[PDB]
Amino acid sequence: SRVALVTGANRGIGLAIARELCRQFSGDVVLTARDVARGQAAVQQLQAEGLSPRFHQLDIDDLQSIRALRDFLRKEYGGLNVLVNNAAVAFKSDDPMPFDIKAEMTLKTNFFATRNMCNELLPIMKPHGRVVNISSLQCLRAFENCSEDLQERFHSETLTEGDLVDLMKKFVEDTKNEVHEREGWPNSPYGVSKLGVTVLSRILARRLDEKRKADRILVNACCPGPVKTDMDGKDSIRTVEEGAETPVYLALLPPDATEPQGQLVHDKVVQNW
Numbered sequence: 001s002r003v004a005l006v007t008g009a010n011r012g013i014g015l016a017i018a019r020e021l022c023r024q025f026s027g028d029v030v031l032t033a034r035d036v037a038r039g040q041a042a043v044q045q046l047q048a049e050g051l052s053p054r055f056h057q058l059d060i061d062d063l064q065s066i067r068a069l070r071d072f073l074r075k076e077y078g079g080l081n082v083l084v085n086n087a088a089v090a091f092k093s094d095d096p097m098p099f100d101i102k103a104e105m106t107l108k109t110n111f112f113a114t115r116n117m118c119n120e121l122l123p124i125m126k127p128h129g130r131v132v133n134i135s136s137l138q139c140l141r142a143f144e145n146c147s148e149d150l151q152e153r154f155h156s157e158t159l160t161e162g163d164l165v166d167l168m169k170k171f172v173e174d175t176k177n178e179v180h181e182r183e184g185w186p187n188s189p190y191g192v193s194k195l196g197v198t199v200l201s202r203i204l205a206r207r208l209d210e211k212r213k214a215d216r217i218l219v220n221a222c223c224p225g226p227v228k229t230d231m232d233g234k235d236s237i238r239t240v241e242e243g244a245e246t247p248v249y250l251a252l253l254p255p256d257a258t259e260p261q262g263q264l265v266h267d268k269v270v271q272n273w
């Protein structure tokens, strides 16, 4: 009857979150991935541990994919109890691309797709459900690197979803027109995308409080914390599993909790910016 779901869950922190929900969540866990071969291999890996996740395909950049997942969840469970929006991209210099494309493709997944996930799936969230949007502490650095005018816009409690969408869209356009510095933006498309995820989280919490406060749904943004690099350049496995701690905490907040709501959370603590 109850069901939790994780996006981008075939490797990294998303896989660690899917594992921990299998251990800690009272209900089914749906591991999702855009690459079905990768997703099913991850499911088999957790099965080899003795766990029982379910699989569903999900590419958050594909609206038909989001809606197929939505339909599956309504049919099988009558909705959703826990949503962890973990899927993200960050393009390094080994993936050479012009800056305006880097900006466009980073915001496409991290912000616009995450937003589409929230809008398609929030209506099917059950009472006392939780939404966890994986952001990054880089979003703070990005905020600090905005002009004062932009900071005031992102910081304001009255900012609407539409205002936010338009600002994110503006970043991308400004990069296409080669004016993003003049316009007060920082240089990190990843940081800007995560700022968007953070602010979207505040907005979705206001919206839930407005339209359905008695459902007691909690939406928070989450920084899984600095991860540490190993000798071979990879994220060390322990710190990757440690990275699941705050997301899982936020996913499993007891039914009576009224806080954190719409907050940015790192190591179980609210980040004030």
Ligand SMILES: NC(=O)c1ccc[n+]([C@@H]2O[C@H](COP(=O)([O-])OP(=O)(O)OC[C@H]3O[C@@H](n4cnc5c(N)ncnc54)[C@H](OP(=O)(O)O)[C@@H]3O)[C@@H](O)[C@H]2O)c1
Binding pocket: 007, 008, 009, 010, 011, 012, 013, 014, 033, 034, 035, 038, 058, 059, 060, 061, 085, 086, 087, 088, 089, 109, 113, 134, 135, 136, 137, 223, 224, 225, 226, 227, 235
């Ligand atoms: N690791 C860190 O140092 C760190 C620190 C702070 C915050 N974070 C955040 O924590 C989250 C997980 O990070 P990670 O380091 O574990 O990431 P990762 O190892 O790079 O894996 C990202 C996951 O997201 C998936 N993904 C990318 N685009 C997708 C799409 N369009 N649809 C569905 N899935 C998609 C990937 O699928 P494929 O395998 O098919 O690529 C993969 O499963 C991210 O939100 C990241 O921004 C990470």
